[PDB]
Coordinates of C-alpha atoms in Angstrom, one line a residue:
Chain A
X409 CA 30.2 1.1 2.2
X410 CA 27.1 -0.1 0.2
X411 CA 26.7 -0.7 -3.5
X412 CA 23.7 -1.5 -5.9
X413 CA 24.0 -4.5 -8.2
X414 CA 22.3 -3.1 -11.3
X415 CA 22.3 -4.9 -14.7
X416 CA 24.3 -2.2 -16.6
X417 CA 26.5 -0.7 -13.8
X418 CA 27.5 -0.9 -10.1
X419 CA 26.7 2.3 -8.1
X420 CA 28.1 3.2 -4.6
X421 CA 25.0 4.2 -2.5
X422 CA 26.6 5.5 0.8
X423 CA 29.1 5.0 3.6
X424 CA 27.9 4.3 7.2
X425 CA 29.7 4.6 10.6
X426 CA 28.8 2.3 13.6
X427 CA 29.4 2.9 17.4
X428 CA 32.3 0.4 17.6
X429 CA 34.4 -2.1 15.5
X430 CA 32.0 -4.3 13.3
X431 CA 32.5 -8.0 13.9
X432 CA 30.2 -9.0 11.0
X433 CA 27.5 -7.8 8.6
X434 CA 24.6 -9.5 6.8
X435 CA 22.2 -8.3 3.9
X436 CA 18.7 -9.4 2.7
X437 CA 15.6 -7.8 1.1
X438 CA 16.0 -3.9 1.5
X439 CA 17.9 -4.4 4.9
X440 CA 21.4 -4.8 6.4
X441 CA 22.2 -6.1 9.9
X442 CA 25.6 -5.1 11.5
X443 CA 27.1 -6.5 14.8
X444 CA 29.7 -4.3 16.7
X445 CA 29.7 -3.6 20.6
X446 CA 27.8 -6.9 21.4
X447 CA 24.7 -5.1 20.0
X448 CA 23.2 -5.4 16.5
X449 CA 21.9 -2.6 14.3
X450 CA 19.3 -3.5 11.6
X451 CA 18.8 -0.8 9.0
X452 CA 17.6 0.0 5.4
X453 CA 20.3 -0.1 2.6
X454 CA 18.3 2.5 0.7
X455 CA 16.3 5.3 2.4
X456 CA 13.6 7.4 0.6
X457 CA 12.6 10.2 3.0
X458 CA 8.8 10.5 2.1
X459 CA 6.1 8.2 3.5
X460 CA 7.9 5.9 6.0
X461 CA 7.9 5.5 9.8
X462 CA 11.4 6.5 11.3
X463 CA 11.5 3.4 13.6
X464 CA 11.7 1.2 10.4
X465 CA 14.7 3.0 8.9
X466 CA 16.9 1.5 11.7
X467 CA 16.6 -0.5 15.0
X468 CA 19.1 -1.6 17.7
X469 CA 19.0 -5.1 19.4
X470 CA 18.4 -6.2 22.1
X471 CA 15.8 -3.5 22.0
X472 CA 14.7 -3.6 25.7
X473 CA 18.4 -2.8 26.6
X474 CA 18.8 -6.1 28.5
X475 CA 22.3 -7.0 30.0
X476 CA 22.8 -9.9 27.4
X477 CA 25.3 -9.4 24.5
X478 CA 24.6 -10.6 21.0
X479 CA 27.6 -12.8 19.8
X480 CA 26.2 -13.7 16.4
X481 CA 23.4 -12.8 13.9
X482 CA 21.9 -13.7 10.4
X483 CA 19.4 -12.2 7.9
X484 CA 16.8 -13.9 5.7
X485 CA 14.0 -12.9 3.3
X486 CA 11.8 -12.4 6.4
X487 CA 13.8 -12.8 9.7
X488 CA 16.6 -11.1 11.6
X489 CA 18.0 -13.9 13.8
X490 CA 20.6 -13.6 16.6
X491 CA 22.3 -15.6 19.4
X492 CA 23.5 -14.2 22.9
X493 CA 26.0 -14.8 25.7
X494 CA 23.0 -15.8 27.9
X495 CA 22.3 -18.6 25.4
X496 CA 19.2 -17.0 24.0
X497 CA 18.3 -17.4 20.3
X498 CA 15.7 -14.8 19.0
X499 CA 13.8 -14.3 15.7
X500 CA 12.6 -10.8 14.7
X501 CA 10.2 -10.6 11.8
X502 CA 11.1 -7.7 9.5
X503 CA 7.7 -7.1 7.7
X504 CA 5.6 -6.5 10.9
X505 CA 8.8 -5.3 12.8
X506 CA 8.3 -7.6 15.9
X507 CA 9.8 -10.6 17.9
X508 CA 8.2 -14.0 17.0
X509 CA 10.3 -16.8 18.6
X510 CA 12.6 -17.1 21.7
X511 CA 14.7 -20.2 22.8
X512 CA 17.2 -20.5 25.7
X513 CA 20.2 -22.8 25.4
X514 CA 22.0 -23.8 28.7
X515 CA 25.3 -21.9 27.6
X516 CA 26.1 -19.0 25.2
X517 CA 25.4 -19.3 21.5
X518 CA 28.6 -18.5 19.6
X519 CA 27.5 -18.7 15.8
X520 CA 24.2 -19.2 13.8
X521 CA 23.4 -20.3 10.2
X522 CA 19.8 -20.3 8.8
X523 CA 18.4 -22.2 5.8
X524 CA 17.5 -20.0 2.8
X525 CA 14.0 -19.2 4.2
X526 CA 14.8 -19.3 8.0
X527 CA 12.7 -22.4 9.0
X528 CA 15.8 -24.3 10.1
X529 CA 18.9 -22.9 11.9
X530 CA 22.2 -24.4 12.8
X531 CA 23.8 -22.9 15.9
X532 CA 27.2 -23.5 17.6
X533 CA 27.4 -23.1 21.4
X534 CA 30.1 -22.2 24.0
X535 CA 31.4 -25.8 24.0
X536 CA 31.6 -25.7 20.2
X537 CA 28.7 -28.2 20.0
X538 CA 26.5 -27.9 16.9
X539 CA 22.6 -28.0 17.0
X540 CA 19.8 -27.8 14.5
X541 CA 17.0 -25.5 15.8
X542 CA 13.5 -25.6 14.3
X543 CA 11.7 -22.3 15.4
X544 CA 8.5 -23.7 13.7
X545 CA 8.1 -26.4 16.5
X546 CA 10.7 -24.8 18.9
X547 CA 12.7 -28.1 19.0
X548 CA 16.5 -28.6 19.1
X549 CA 18.5 -31.6 17.6
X550 CA 22.2 -32.2 18.5
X551 CA 24.4 -32.6 15.4
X552 CA 26.4 -35.9 15.8
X553 CA 30.3 -36.0 15.5
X554 CA 30.4 -32.1 15.2
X555 CA 34.2 -31.1 15.3
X556 CA 35.1 -28.1 17.6
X557 CA 37.4 -26.9 14.7
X558 CA 34.3 -26.0 12.6
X559 CA 34.4 -22.4 11.2
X560 CA 31.0 -22.2 9.4
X561 CA 27.9 -23.9 7.9
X562 CA 26.1 -23.8 4.5
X563 CA 22.6 -25.2 3.6
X564 CA 21.9 -26.9 0.2
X565 CA 20.0 -24.7 -2.3
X566 CA 18.9 -27.8 -4.5
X567 CA 15.1 -28.6 -4.3
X568 CA 15.3 -32.4 -3.6
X569 CA 17.8 -31.8 -0.7
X570 CA 16.2 -29.1 1.5
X571 CA 17.3 -31.0 4.7
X572 CA 21.0 -31.2 3.6
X573 CA 23.7 -28.9 5.1
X574 CA 27.4 -28.9 5.4
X575 CA 29.8 -27.8 8.2
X576 CA 33.4 -27.0 7.5
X577 CA 36.9 -26.2 8.9
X578 CA 40.3 -25.4 7.3
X579 CA 40.9 -29.1 6.1
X580 CA 37.4 -30.8 5.7
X581 CA 33.7 -30.4 4.9
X582 CA 31.2 -32.6 6.8
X583 CA 27.8 -33.4 5.0
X584 CA 24.8 -33.6 7.3
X585 CA 21.1 -34.4 6.6
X586 CA 18.2 -33.3 8.9
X587 CA 15.5 -36.0 8.4
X588 CA 12.3 -34.1 9.5
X589 CA 9.5 -36.6 8.5
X590 CA 10.3 -40.2 9.5
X591 CA 8.5 -42.9 11.6
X592 CA 11.2 -42.7 14.3
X593 CA 10.8 -38.8 14.6
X594 CA 13.1 -36.0 13.5
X595 CA 16.9 -36.5 13.5
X596 CA 20.3 -35.2 12.2
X597 CA 22.6 -37.8 10.5
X598 CA 26.3 -37.5 9.3
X599 CA 26.3 -38.6 5.6
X600 CA 30.1 -38.2 5.1
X601 CA 33.2 -36.0 4.8
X602 CA 35.1 -34.3 1.9
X603 CA 38.7 -33.0 2.1
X604 CA 39.1 -29.3 1.1
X605 CA 42.3 -28.1 -0.6
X606 CA 44.6 -25.8 1.5
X607 CA 43.1 -22.3 2.4
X608 CA 39.9 -22.8 0.2
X609 CA 36.9 -21.1 1.9
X610 CA 33.3 -22.5 1.1
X611 CA 30.7 -19.9 -0.2
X612 CA 27.8 -21.8 -1.9
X613 CA 26.4 -25.4 -1.9
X614 CA 24.3 -26.4 -4.9
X615 CA 23.3 -30.0 -5.8
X616 CA 26.5 -31.4 -4.0
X617 CA 28.7 -28.9 -5.9
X618 CA 30.6 -26.7 -3.4
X619 CA 31.9 -23.4 -4.7
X620 CA 35.0 -22.2 -2.7
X621 CA 37.2 -19.0 -2.8
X622 CA 41.0 -19.6 -3.3
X623 CA 44.0 -17.6 -1.9
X624 CA 44.5 -16.3 -5.5
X625 CA 41.1 -14.4 -5.4
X626 CA 39.5 -17.0 -7.9
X627 CA 36.6 -19.4 -7.2
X628 CA 36.9 -23.2 -7.6
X629 CA 34.2 -25.9 -7.5
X630 CA 34.5 -29.2 -5.5
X631 CA 32.0 -32.0 -5.9
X632 CA 31.3 -33.5 -2.4
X633 CA 32.3 -37.2 -1.8
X634 CA 28.7 -37.7 -0.7
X635 CA 27.7 -36.8 -4.4
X636 CA 30.2 -38.9 -6.5
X637 CA 27.3 -40.8 -8.1
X638 CA 26.1 -37.6 -10.0
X639 CA 28.7 -38.6 -12.7
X640 CA 27.6 -40.5 -15.8
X641 CA 26.3 -43.9 -14.4
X642 CA 26.2 -45.9 -17.8
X643 CA 30.0 -46.1 -18.3
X644 CA 30.7 -47.8 -14.9
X645 CA 27.3 -49.5 -14.9
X646 CA 26.4 -50.5 -11.2
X647 CA 29.5 -48.9 -9.6
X648 CA 28.4 -45.2 -9.6
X649 CA 24.7 -46.2 -9.8
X650 CA 24.4 -48.2 -6.5
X651 CA 25.5 -45.2 -4.3
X652 CA 23.2 -43.1 -6.6
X653 CA 20.3 -45.5 -5.8
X654 CA 20.9 -45.5 -2.1
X655 CA 21.0 -41.7 -2.0
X656 CA 18.0 -41.2 -4.3
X657 CA 16.0 -43.7 -2.1
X658 CA 16.9 -41.5 1.0
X659 CA 16.0 -38.2 -0.8
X660 CA 12.6 -39.7 -2.0
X661 CA 13.6 -39.1 -5.7
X662 CA 12.0 -42.4 -6.7
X663 CA 11.5 -41.6 -10.4
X664 CA 15.4 -41.5 -10.7
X665 CA 15.7 -44.7 -8.5
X666 CA 13.3 -46.5 -11.0
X667 CA 15.5 -45.8 -14.0
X668 CA 18.5 -47.1 -11.9
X669 CA 16.7 -50.3 -11.0
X670 CA 15.7 -50.8 -14.7
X671 CA 19.5 -50.7 -15.6
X672 CA 20.4 -53.3 -12.8
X673 CA 17.5 -55.7 -13.8
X674 CA 17.9 -57.6 -10.4
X675 CA 15.0 -58.9 -8.3
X676 CA 17.0 -57.9 -5.1
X677 CA 17.3 -54.2 -6.3
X678 CA 13.6 -54.0 -7.0
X679 CA 12.8 -55.5 -3.5
Chain B
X986 CA -16.8 -14.0 -19.6
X987 CA -16.3 -11.6 -22.6
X988 CA -18.7 -9.1 -21.1
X989 CA -17.0 -9.5 -17.7
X990 CA -13.5 -8.8 -19.2
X991 CA -14.8 -5.9 -21.4
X992 CA -16.5 -4.5 -18.3
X993 CA -13.4 -4.8 -16.3
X994 CA -11.4 -3.0 -19.1
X995 CA -13.9 -0.2 -18.9
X996 CA -15.3 -0.9 -22.5
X997 CA -19.0 -1.0 -21.5
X998 CA -20.2 -0.2 -25.1
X999 CA -18.6 -3.2 -26.7
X1000 CA -20.0 -5.3 -23.8
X1001 CA -23.4 -3.9 -24.5
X1002 CA -23.1 -4.7 -28.2
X1003 CA -22.1 -8.3 -27.4
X1004 CA -25.0 -8.6 -24.9
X1005 CA -27.5 -7.2 -27.4
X1006 CA -26.3 -9.3 -30.4
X1007 CA -26.0 -12.7 -28.5
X1008 CA -29.1 -12.3 -26.3
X1009 CA -27.2 -14.2 -23.4
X1010 CA -29.2 -14.0 -20.1
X1011 CA -26.2 -14.2 -17.8
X1012 CA -24.2 -11.6 -19.8
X1013 CA -27.2 -9.2 -19.8
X1014 CA -27.6 -9.7 -16.0
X1015 CA -23.9 -8.9 -15.4
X1016 CA -24.0 -5.8 -17.6
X1017 CA -27.2 -4.7 -15.8
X1018 CA -25.4 -4.9 -12.4
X1019 CA -22.6 -2.7 -13.8
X1020 CA -25.1 -0.1 -15.0
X1021 CA -26.8 -0.3 -11.6
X1022 CA -23.5 0.5 -9.9
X1023 CA -23.0 3.4 -12.3
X1024 CA -26.6 4.6 -11.3
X1025 CA -27.8 4.4 -15.0
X1026 CA -31.3 3.1 -14.0
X1027 CA -32.9 3.0 -17.5
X1028 CA -30.1 0.8 -19.1
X1029 CA -30.0 -1.3 -15.9
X1030 CA -33.8 -2.1 -16.0
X1031 CA -33.6 -2.7 -19.8
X1032 CA -30.8 -5.4 -19.4
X1033 CA -32.5 -6.9 -16.3
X1034 CA -35.7 -7.3 -18.4
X1035 CA -33.6 -8.8 -21.3
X1036 CA -32.1 -11.2 -18.7
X1037 CA -35.7 -12.2 -17.6
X1038 CA -34.6 -11.2 -14.0
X1039 CA -38.0 -9.4 -13.4
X1040 CA -37.5 -9.2 -9.6
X1041 CA -34.3 -7.1 -9.7
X1042 CA -35.9 -4.8 -12.3
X1043 CA -39.1 -4.5 -10.1
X1044 CA -36.9 -3.6 -7.0
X1045 CA -34.8 -1.1 -8.9
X1046 CA -38.0 0.4 -10.3
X1047 CA -39.7 0.6 -6.8
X1048 CA -36.5 2.3 -5.3
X1049 CA -36.3 4.9 -8.1
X1050 CA -40.1 5.5 -8.6
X1051 CA -40.1 4.0 -12.2
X1052 CA -43.9 3.2 -12.0
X1053 CA -44.0 3.3 -15.9
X1054 CA -41.3 0.6 -16.2
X1055 CA -43.0 -1.3 -13.3
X1056 CA -46.2 -1.2 -15.5
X1057 CA -44.3 -2.8 -18.4
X1058 CA -42.8 -5.4 -16.0
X1059 CA -46.3 -6.1 -14.6
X1060 CA -47.8 -6.4 -18.2
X1061 CA -45.0 -8.9 -19.1
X1062 CA -45.5 -10.9 -15.8
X1063 CA -48.3 -13.2 -14.5
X1064 CA -51.8 -11.9 -13.4
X1065 CA -50.8 -12.4 -9.7
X1066 CA -47.8 -10.1 -10.3
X1067 CA -50.1 -7.6 -12.2
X1068 CA -52.3 -7.6 -9.0
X1069 CA -49.2 -7.1 -6.7
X1070 CA -48.3 -4.2 -9.0
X1071 CA -51.9 -2.8 -9.0
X1072 CA -51.7 -3.0 -5.2
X1073 CA -48.4 -1.0 -5.2
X1074 CA -50.2 1.8 -7.3
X1075 CA -53.3 1.5 -5.1
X1076 CA -51.1 2.1 -2.0
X1077 CA -49.6 5.2 -3.6
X1078 CA -53.1 6.5 -4.8
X1079 CA -51.4 8.4 -7.6
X1080 CA -51.7 5.8 -10.4
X1081 CA -55.3 4.4 -9.8
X1082 CA -55.9 4.1 -13.6
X1083 CA -53.0 1.6 -13.9
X1084 CA -54.3 -0.2 -10.7
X1085 CA -57.9 -0.7 -12.1
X1086 CA -56.5 -1.5 -15.6
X1087 CA -54.2 -4.2 -14.1
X1088 CA -57.1 -5.7 -12.0
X1089 CA -59.4 -5.7 -15.1
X1090 CA -56.6 -7.2 -17.4
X1091 CA -56.0 -9.8 -14.7
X1092 CA -59.7 -10.7 -14.9
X1093 CA -60.4 -9.9 -11.2
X1094 CA -63.7 -8.1 -11.6
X1095 CA -64.8 -8.0 -7.9
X1096 CA -61.6 -6.0 -6.9
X1097 CA -61.6 -4.0 -10.2
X1098 CA -65.2 -3.0 -9.3
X1099 CA -64.4 -2.3 -5.6
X1100 CA -61.4 -0.1 -6.6
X1101 CA -63.3 1.6 -9.5
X1102 CA -66.1 2.3 -7.0
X1103 CA -63.4 3.7 -4.5
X1104 CA -61.7 5.8 -7.2
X1105 CA -65.1 6.8 -8.9
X1106 CA -63.7 5.6 -12.3
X1107 CA -67.0 5.6 -14.3
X1108 CA -65.3 4.6 -17.6
Chain C
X1017 CA -3.7 -23.4 14.1
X1018 CA -4.4 -24.8 10.6
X1019 CA -0.6 -25.1 9.8
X1020 CA -0.1 -26.8 13.3
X1021 CA -2.9 -29.3 12.4
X1022 CA -1.3 -30.0 9.0
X1023 CA 1.9 -31.2 10.8
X1024 CA -0.3 -34.0 12.4
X1025 CA -1.1 -35.3 8.8
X1026 CA 0.8 -37.1 6.0
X1027 CA 1.4 -34.1 3.7
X1028 CA 2.3 -34.7 -0.1
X1029 CA 5.5 -33.0 -1.4
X1030 CA 3.7 -30.1 -3.4
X1031 CA 1.8 -29.1 -0.3
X1032 CA 4.9 -29.7 2.0
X1033 CA 7.0 -27.1 0.1
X1034 CA 4.2 -24.5 0.3
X1035 CA 3.5 -25.4 4.0
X1036 CA 7.1 -24.8 5.1
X1037 CA 7.0 -21.2 3.7
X1038 CA 3.4 -20.9 4.9
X1039 CA 4.3 -21.8 8.5
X1040 CA 7.1 -19.2 8.7
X1041 CA 5.1 -16.5 6.9
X1042 CA 2.1 -16.9 9.2
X1043 CA 4.1 -17.1 12.5
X1044 CA 5.6 -13.8 11.5
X1045 CA 2.1 -12.1 11.3
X1046 CA 0.0 -10.7 14.3
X1047 CA -1.6 -13.1 16.9
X1048 CA -5.4 -12.3 16.2
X1049 CA -8.2 -13.0 13.7
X1050 CA -10.2 -10.3 11.8
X1051 CA -13.6 -9.6 13.6
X1052 CA -15.5 -9.4 10.2
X1053 CA -14.9 -13.1 9.6
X1054 CA -16.5 -14.2 13.0
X1055 CA -20.0 -15.8 12.3
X1056 CA -23.0 -14.4 14.2
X1057 CA -25.7 -16.7 15.5
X1058 CA -29.0 -15.0 14.4
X1059 CA -31.0 -16.7 17.2
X1060 CA -28.9 -15.5 20.2
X1061 CA -26.8 -12.6 18.6
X1062 CA -23.6 -14.3 19.8
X1063 CA -20.3 -14.1 17.8
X1064 CA -18.9 -17.7 17.4
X1065 CA -15.2 -18.7 17.3
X1066 CA -14.0 -19.7 13.8
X1067 CA -13.5 -23.4 14.8
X1068 CA -15.2 -25.1 17.8
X1069 CA -15.5 -28.6 19.3
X1070 CA -19.3 -28.8 18.9
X1071 CA -19.2 -28.3 15.1
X1072 CA -21.8 -26.4 12.9
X1073 CA -23.8 -25.3 16.0
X1074 CA -23.7 -22.0 18.1
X1075 CA -21.4 -22.3 21.2
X1076 CA -24.1 -20.5 23.3
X1077 CA -27.6 -21.7 22.2
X1078 CA -26.5 -24.9 20.3
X1079 CA -28.7 -23.8 17.3
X1080 CA -27.7 -25.6 14.1
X1081 CA -26.3 -23.2 11.5
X1082 CA -28.0 -23.1 8.0
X1083 CA -25.6 -22.3 5.2
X1084 CA -25.9 -20.8 1.7
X1085 CA -25.2 -23.7 -0.7
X1086 CA -23.3 -21.1 -3.0
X1087 CA -20.9 -19.7 -0.5
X1088 CA -21.3 -21.4 2.9
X1089 CA -22.1 -18.2 4.7
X1090 CA -24.6 -18.6 7.7
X1091 CA -28.1 -17.5 6.3
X1092 CA -30.0 -15.4 9.0
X1093 CA -32.6 -18.3 9.2
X1094 CA -34.0 -20.1 12.3
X1095 CA -35.7 -23.5 12.0
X1096 CA -39.0 -23.8 13.9
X1097 CA -41.5 -26.6 14.7
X1098 CA -45.3 -26.6 14.8
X1099 CA -47.2 -27.0 18.1
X1100 CA -49.0 -30.3 18.6
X1101 CA -52.4 -30.6 16.8
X1102 CA -51.5 -28.3 13.8
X1103 CA -51.3 -29.9 10.3
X1104 CA -48.9 -28.7 7.5
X1105 CA -51.9 -27.5 5.4
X1106 CA -53.3 -25.6 8.5
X1107 CA -49.9 -24.1 9.2
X1108 CA -49.7 -22.8 5.6
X1109 CA -53.3 -21.4 5.8
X1110 CA -52.3 -19.5 9.0
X1111 CA -49.0 -18.3 7.5
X1149 CA -44.1 -12.8 19.0
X1150 CA -41.4 -15.1 17.4
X1151 CA -38.5 -12.8 18.3
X1152 CA -39.8 -12.8 21.9
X1153 CA -39.3 -16.6 22.0
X1154 CA -35.7 -16.3 20.6
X1155 CA -34.8 -13.7 23.4
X1156 CA -36.2 -15.9 26.2
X1157 CA -34.7 -19.4 25.5
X1158 CA -30.9 -18.3 25.7
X1159 CA -28.2 -19.7 28.0
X1160 CA -29.4 -23.4 28.3
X1161 CA -27.1 -26.5 28.5
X1162 CA -28.6 -28.3 25.4
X1163 CA -30.4 -27.5 22.1
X1164 CA -34.1 -26.5 22.5
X1165 CA -36.2 -26.4 19.3
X1166 CA -38.4 -23.3 18.7
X1167 CA -42.1 -24.4 19.0
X1168 CA -44.7 -22.2 17.3
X1169 CA -48.5 -21.9 18.1
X1170 CA -51.4 -20.8 15.8
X1171 CA -51.2 -17.2 17.2
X1172 CA -47.5 -16.9 16.3
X1173 CA -48.1 -18.4 12.8
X1174 CA -50.8 -15.7 12.2
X1175 CA -48.2 -13.0 13.1
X1176 CA -45.7 -14.3 10.4
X1177 CA -45.7 -13.2 6.7
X1178 CA -45.3 -15.7 3.8
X1179 CA -42.4 -13.5 2.4
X1180 CA -40.3 -14.3 5.5
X1181 CA -41.0 -18.1 5.8
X1182 CA -39.3 -21.0 3.9
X1183 CA -41.0 -24.5 3.9
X1184 CA -39.2 -27.7 2.8
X1185 CA -42.1 -29.9 1.3
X1186 CA -40.4 -33.3 1.6
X1187 CA -42.1 -36.4 0.1
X1188 CA -43.7 -39.0 2.5
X1189 CA -42.6 -40.3 5.0
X1190 CA -40.7 -37.1 6.0
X1191 CA -42.5 -34.1 7.7
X1192 CA -42.3 -30.6 6.3
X1193 CA -39.6 -28.2 7.8
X1194 CA -40.3 -24.5 8.5
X1195 CA -37.8 -21.7 8.7
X1196 CA -38.0 -17.9 9.6
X1197 CA -35.8 -15.2 8.0
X1198 CA -34.6 -12.7 10.7
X1199 CA -33.5 -10.1 8.0
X1200 CA -36.4 -9.8 5.4
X1201 CA -34.3 -7.1 3.5
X1202 CA -31.7 -9.8 2.6
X1203 CA -33.5 -12.1 0.2
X1204 CA -33.2 -16.0 0.4
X1205 CA -34.1 -18.4 -2.4
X1206 CA -34.6 -22.2 -2.1
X1207 CA -34.6 -24.9 -4.8
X1208 CA -38.0 -26.6 -5.1
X1209 CA -36.3 -30.0 -6.0
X1210 CA -33.5 -30.5 -3.4
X1211 CA -34.5 -27.8 -0.8
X1212 CA -31.0 -26.3 -0.7
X1213 CA -31.0 -22.6 0.4
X1214 CA -29.1 -19.7 -1.2
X1215 CA -28.9 -15.9 -1.3
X1216 CA -31.3 -15.0 -4.2
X1217 CA -28.7 -13.1 -6.3
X1218 CA -26.3 -16.1 -6.0
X1219 CA -29.0 -18.6 -6.9
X1220 CA -30.2 -16.6 -10.0
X1221 CA -26.5 -16.1 -11.2
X1222 CA -25.7 -19.9 -10.6
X1223 CA -28.9 -20.9 -12.4
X1224 CA -28.0 -18.6 -15.3
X1225 CA -24.4 -20.0 -15.4
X1226 CA -25.4 -23.7 -15.2
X1227 CA -28.9 -23.5 -16.9
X1228 CA -30.0 -25.5 -13.7
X1229 CA -29.8 -25.8 -9.9
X1230 CA -26.0 -26.3 -9.1
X1231 CA -26.8 -29.0 -6.5
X1232 CA -29.5 -31.2 -8.1
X1233 CA -29.4 -30.2 -11.8
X1234 CA -33.1 -29.3 -12.2
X1235 CA -33.6 -26.8 -15.1
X1236 CA -35.6 -23.5 -14.5
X1237 CA -38.2 -24.5 -17.2
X1238 CA -38.9 -28.0 -15.8
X1239 CA -42.3 -28.3 -14.1
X1240 CA -42.0 -29.9 -10.6
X1241 CA -43.1 -33.4 -9.4

């Protein structure tokens, strides 16, 4: 069942029936993507009958009717993305209605999680191993120390931290950083771990603040342990500021790191 | 830029008022091109002449057969361009009075005499 | 191809943000370039690829491209050279050409167009541009291959333009945009 999020009221649009039990559904732009019988249906949320091509109202994947089964999918501002039992990851561009990247992993791809644009993906394989995939250069980077208990992944929405993501299970969140541009070449690094209260489910990451759903239906916010420095530095002086400095150096936020070194007034901190 | 934005808004009259009052050559040129696109040949030639862009006005006159406005453009131009205009009339054969007048006003008596002989213009 | 070349360079953060979105949003689009953008060589009538390893020369005849200093469009001009024993003043007094440009095509290196007294007599002064450099430089001669599309050239810096662009730029700036000579200034 689909609903419009208008400013004054919420309106039910329609109900839709699929060919089998829906495993998951994703929404972006005017479009929804639903996974059921090991196949994905992409479709419009709103149909106006005049002046559109019928093949753009809905499409089924994989569209060639190959023997491979889709196990997972995601939807961005531009791309339908999905992963298969044959280990294939595919990008379909929505505006020109065509495939645009294809990668094959040695084993099946079990789950996928794009950044807010689609330019980085995290995928989890049949061995529960996590990988960052960059469709823009077709490269894959193995995520270090990735726990097989991980249920999902969220990317950071804050502008200084575009390479930051988190992976989570029932007990913990792990904070990861993809360093793209460095002299050693691109790599994924574990920055730390944060304990999650019982049965809280992560929904949004923003500036190291993690919004979680509780068993009571309410939301609750958790600041990541990798972000404790965001507290007011002046009252502990160096103690919250030194981990701020280290992180702001690594995030290239050097205008913040300058004010921190001004507070320390140490020839070593300037060096 | 005022005439450009007024022309874009469809207010061509206010643009023309600004171009007339200011005397700006670039504004008069732009306005002339808009009038050219609207096929208003007389206003286009006027504003090209006000912009001192005699060559565009000459071309637009030659394409529309405005031999009268070509004569005004010739009489405003140098004696060489008077002779080139005389030659354009001499090639048509219809305006041989303006041709001989322009050769005589340009001071080129040999060709004024040869063409007045050829056209039997005794006056 | 331009977004893949950018990834070989040290991109600043403002451009990096736009380039991440730009890389996705192009790779999404079709895999071809619009035919209307592809530059014609006017000497050999060959369509040239939008970037090439030889630079600002035709891939077929190796003719150097001549560009409008307003817009950097290729100008329907071919540079030509006087035959031995003709002076610059004699060449102007004299001022078949297309039949040379059709013959010389398909060679391995650039060949300059060389022009005799008979071919100079067959030209018209309306079609020919002459760069009157100060000594020690020799004068350079160019033929327009589309007389209906007018070209203008600055008498100070010898930069070449479409005539409408040059008149509009001189009206905007009160002077030549390249060398700042005013329209009312008598030449050297």
